[PDB]
Design a protein around this ligand. Structure first.
Ligand SMILES: Nc1ccc(-c2ccccc2)cc1NC(=O)c1ccccc1
Ligand SMILES: [Ca+2]
Ligand code: NA
Ligand SMILES: [Zn+2]
Length: 367
């Protein structure tokens, strides 16, 4: 039926700034929030402000040294930490900015808080659009991500769930999450991503897990230009089979929006409806569900996508005509919720889509 939804947001989020020209704009989370509030969606869900996750919380996965560094590093003391910066991959893609650690605390706090809420059976779904930082590693920043809120949330869920399923529709491979759980069967990770001379360079379909986790990592490598139809042909069959074989008791869905048509950094051709179809599919399994954000660099479309996916989680139909909001000018020239795909070529033939699906199905028979 209709599900109870708890939603995590801290209004301070939009004030963090990666620096001039950096494509990651935390402000997109405020835009998303402002938009969904103007559609009246606050009426249907509980809105929480997450706590700032502590170093204790973060060191449930990350090394004490990496976290102490993140707590210490500031733009005013960078010159002293030059070695440590290189060791932990900070100062380029992953810059030092004012309030960096607090920004990690806020985005992490939402995922961990949502996981606790699900564990206590006090919601059916928890939403943290500030989370989904899938590239962060035990002792290293990567791809704009510093602290892996997702691995932390999953570790929380594993306190009460024998098997947790992770699904990642970000255009990039979820390497940090896959890496953390690569050798366990208690977390199956499923990533659909662009593959071939593309960040982070991992997620070959032959990467299937190791030891006890062998066959519990599933990767669907894709080419430029994938569209709603190609994606839809593959997503539901794969997830259904995964659900059948794996029988998870909780699910974490990363909804990274850099897989949308027109993304500044991505090269997929999905609409908001195509992207959201993935949320609908996962929803129908009626399992405790943590939905997280992720990448997304054309910020008007990120706001539309996550607003609509919040509406999907709520089974709440919203008009295509955008309500007035604080960021109304970002949504021109159309001022509509939904987007059109571009005319870019889909390098993913139907045959390629079916062949990869078939290989993945063979692996799933091994469960
Ligand atoms: N993939 C991803 C997911 C979440 C965050 C993220 C989400 C919230 C806060 C911080 C990072 C950042 C990324 N990084 C990229 O998308 C990317 C793009 C180009 C090159 C390298 C990486
Ligand atoms: Ca992905
Ligand atoms: Na695993
Ligand atoms: Zn991404």
């Amino acid at each position: 039926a209709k599900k109870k939804v708890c939603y995590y947001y801290d209004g301070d989020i939009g004030n963090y700034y990666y620096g001039q020209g950096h494509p990651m704009k935390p402000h997109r989370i405020r835009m998303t929030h402002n938009l969904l509030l103007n559609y009246g969606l606050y009426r249907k869900m509980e809105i929480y402000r997450p706590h700032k996750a502590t170093a204790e919380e973060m060191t449930k996965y990350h090394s004490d040294e990496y976290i102490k560094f993140l707590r210490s590093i500031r733009p005013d003391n960078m010159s002293e930490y030059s070695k440590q910066m290189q060791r932990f991959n900070v100062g380029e893609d992953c810059p030092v900015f004012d309030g960096l650690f607090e920004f990690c605390q806020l985005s992490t706090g939402g995922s961990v808080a949502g996981a606790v809420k699900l564990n206590r059976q006090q919601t059916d779904m928890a939403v943290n659009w500030a989370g989904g930082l899938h590239h962060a590693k035990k002792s290293e920043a990567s791809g704009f991500c510093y602290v892996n809120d997702i691995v932390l949330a999953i570790l929380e869920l594993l306190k009460y769930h024998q098997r947790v399923l992770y699904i990642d529709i970000d255009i990039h491979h979820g390497d940090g999450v896959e890496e953390a759980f690569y050798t366990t069967d208690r977390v199956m990770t499923v990533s659909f991503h662009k593959y071939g001379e593309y960040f982070p360079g991992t997620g070959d379909l032959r990467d299937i897990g190791a030891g006890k986790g062998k066959y519990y990592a599933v990767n669907f490598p894709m080419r430029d230009g994938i569209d709603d139809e190609s994606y839809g042909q593959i997503f539901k069959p794969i997830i259904s089979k995964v659900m059948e074989m794996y029988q998870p008791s909780a699910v974490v869905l990363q909804c990274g929006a850099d897989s949308l048509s027109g993304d500044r950094l991505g090269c997929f051709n999905l609409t908001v409806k195509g992207h959201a179809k993935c949320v609908e599919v996962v929803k129908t399994f009626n399992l405790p569900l943590l939905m997280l954000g992720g990448g997304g660099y054309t910020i008007r479309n990120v706001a539309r996508c996550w607003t609509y996916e919040t509406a999907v989680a709520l089974d709440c139909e919203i008009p295509n005509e955008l309500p007035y909001n604080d960021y109304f000018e970002y949504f021109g020239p159309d001022f509509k919720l939904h987007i059109s795909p571009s005319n870019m070529t889909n390098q993913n033939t139907p045959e390629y889509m079916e062949k990869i699906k078939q290989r993945l199905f063979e692996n799933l028979r091994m469960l």
